[PDB]
């Protein structure tokens, strides 16, 4: 147990140990507020997330537990890790606050692309790194479901980290069409759609699909991928959507050569295999890595798959004290990473 201290940061109380020096609200992080802090027992520049009412609800309680378990398992370079997990709690019948810690990067891929367009080598390193992150996440049977530049954290030396994974359920701009229109059974390839919306954007400095609603967004989608054909229009079941498509203007597929003008031929080819409207035809994270474009970066011997990750709790219906105890048990039981 360490020396604690109580401070305030923009209308909220922040109870954090002696070691966590200098704090500052850097931006909007999933579930609660995040702070930029400077460590001591390691002495680095970290990010600290204070969860918003983590146990106030059955949703919040099942989502507090979920995250703490994803980060206690994710040991891969381009995947967000867990440096520390703390509470000001003396007991379990007190424990109603949770804070998780990990390194702070330079900027996110959204603030990177704003200033400005990135060459055919920056892109090679960034997409490779995104997908190599995805491959580790995926083999542990987790999908992202909300992959977009803002959750893709990067360093000055271009080294990448994926954020806010495995939490999403129930940005649309990088969201897969089948998960947005409820067309098919769906799989881990909804993020493979996201990377092609990201890739293309680092290659043009232009949001591929800056649509306005579920209707405008999709109209922007076909406006590039061509209306579902004879192979696809059979597969879709969704009575509303299945009847909705055949009532749109007949559009052809565009040439990704005549869209991404000047682009390295292999980028055009991989993009094509990314914006496929067939969730079963579409390429996978591991498949995408063995593509000629990543010839120089790719080495299957340094692209690892994850240690088995237990999701048995994900179908479970438990009470708040049950969850609040499971998380408490995981908070107290965590052991720092080895240097």
Residues that bind ligand 38P (CB under 6 A): 26, 29, 34, 47-49, 67, 70-71, 80, 100, 102, 104-108, 153, 163-167
Cα–Cα dist 82/102, whole Å: 5
- The answer to whether 323 and 68 are in contact (CB under 8 A) is no
Distance of CA 167 to the CA centre of its chain: 9
Q: Which of 324, 3, 292, 284 is nearest to 124 (CA)?
A: 292
Which residue numbers in the chain precede an interruption (C–N > 2.5 Å)?
170
Cα–Cα dist 329/339, whole Å: 25
Return phi, psi of residue 131, to 5°: -70, -35
> Which CB sits closer to ligand 38P, 25 or 304?
25
Binding residue positions for ATP: 26-34, 49
164 is catalytic: yes
| Closest separation in Å from C-beta 292 to ligand 38P | 31
> Which CB sits closer to ligand 38P, 14 or 256?
14
> Which CB sits closer to ligand 38P, 153 or 288?
153
> Which CB sits closer to ligand 38P, 20 or 293?
20
| Closest separation in Å from C-beta 264 to ligand 38P | 28
Which of 84, 146, 164, 191 is flagged as catalytic?
Answer: 164
Q: What is the three-class DSSP state of 85?
A: strand
- Token output for 19: 């070691």
> Which CB sits closer to ligand 38P, 279 or 327?
327
DSSP codes of every residue in 206-259: S-S---SSHHHHHHHHHHHH-S--TTHHHH---HHHHHHHTTS---PPPPSTTT
Q: Which of 60, 71, 140, 58 is nearest to 100 (CA)?
A: 71
Element (H, E) at 285: helix 285-289
- The answer to whether 330 and 65 are in contact (CB under 8 A) is yes
Element (H, E) at 5: strand 4-8
Cα four-point dihedral sign 185, 189, 191, 197: negative
- Residues identified as active-site: 164
């Amino acid at each position: 147990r360490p020396t604690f201290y109580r401070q305030e940061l923009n209308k909220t109380i922040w109870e954090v140990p002696e070691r966590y020096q200098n704090l500052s609200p850097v931006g909007s992080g999933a579930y609660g507020s995040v702070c930029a802090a400077f460590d001591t027992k390691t002495g680095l520049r970290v990010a600290v997330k204070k969860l918003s009412r983590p146990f106030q609800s059955i949703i919040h309680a099942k989502r507090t537990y979920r995250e703490l378990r994803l980060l206690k398992h994710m040991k891969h370079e381009n995947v967000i890790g867990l440096l520390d997990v703390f509470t000001p709690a003396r007991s379990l019948e007190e424990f109603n606050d949770v804070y998780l810690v990990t390194h702070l990067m330079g900027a996110d891929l959204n603030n990177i692309v704003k200033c400005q367009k990135l060459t055919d080598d920056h892109v090679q390193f960034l997409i490779y790194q995104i997908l190599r992150g995805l491959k580790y996440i995926h083999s542990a049977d987790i999908i992202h479901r909300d992959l977009k530049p803002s959750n893709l954290a990067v360093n000055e030396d271009c080294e990448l980290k994926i954020l806010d994974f495995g939490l999403a359920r129930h940005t649309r701009w990088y969201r897969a069409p089948e998960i947005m229109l409820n067309w098919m059974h769906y799989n881990q390839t909804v993020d493979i759609w996201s990377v092609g919306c990201i890739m293309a954007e680092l290659l043009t400095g232009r949001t591929l699909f800056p649509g306005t609603d579920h209707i405008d967004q999709l109209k922007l989608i076909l406006r590039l991928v061509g209306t579902p054909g004879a192979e696809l229009l059979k597969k879709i079941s969704s009575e509303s959507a299945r009847n909705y498509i055949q009532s749109l203007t007949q559009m052809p597929k565009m040439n990704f050569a005549n869209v991404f003008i000047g682009a390295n031929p292999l980028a055009v080819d991989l993009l094509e295999k990314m914006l496929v409207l067939d969730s079963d035809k579409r390429i996978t994270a591991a498949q995408a890595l063995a593509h000629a474009y990543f010839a120089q970066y790719h080495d299957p011997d340094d692209e690892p798959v994850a240690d088995p990750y237990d999701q048995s709790f994900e179908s479970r219906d438990l009470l708040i004290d049950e969850w609040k105890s499971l998380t408490y048990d995981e908070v107290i039981s965590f052991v720092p990473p080895p240097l």
